[PDB]
Design a protein around this nucleic acid. Structure first.
Length: 45
RNA sequence: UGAUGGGGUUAGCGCAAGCGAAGCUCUUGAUCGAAGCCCCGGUAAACGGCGGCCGUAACUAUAACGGUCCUAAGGUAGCGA
């Protein structure tokens, strides 16, 4: 199925417009433990 | 205003050229001499003037931004085929 992208009416490049689109934003994950790992309640209980 | 210097003329000293004092003259004109101009600042509802180039962002585009040259200063608000 289709994808409703950000950049309305992409002209030239058909692949370097989507690279800035939030489909290809940088997925950064969370640490544990690690500079930024506070729980407050974890996955269970 | 006329210093100072130069020239003409001639009483005279030299039988020669030549020099030549006073006086009268022709000329040069140092000195003294103000505003103005140059110079110093001001004033634009005084006359007037009020920029180029070159890049630069999340496809493209455009450039908020940056570089550099020049000017007395680079046109601001408002409007604008």
């Amino acid at each position: 199925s289709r994808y409703q992208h950000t950049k309305g009416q992409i002209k030239d490049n058909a692949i370097e417009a989507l690279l800035h689109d939030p489909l290809f934003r940088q997925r950064v994950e969370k640490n544990k433990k690690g500079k930024g790992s506070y729980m407050r309640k974890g996955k269970h209980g």
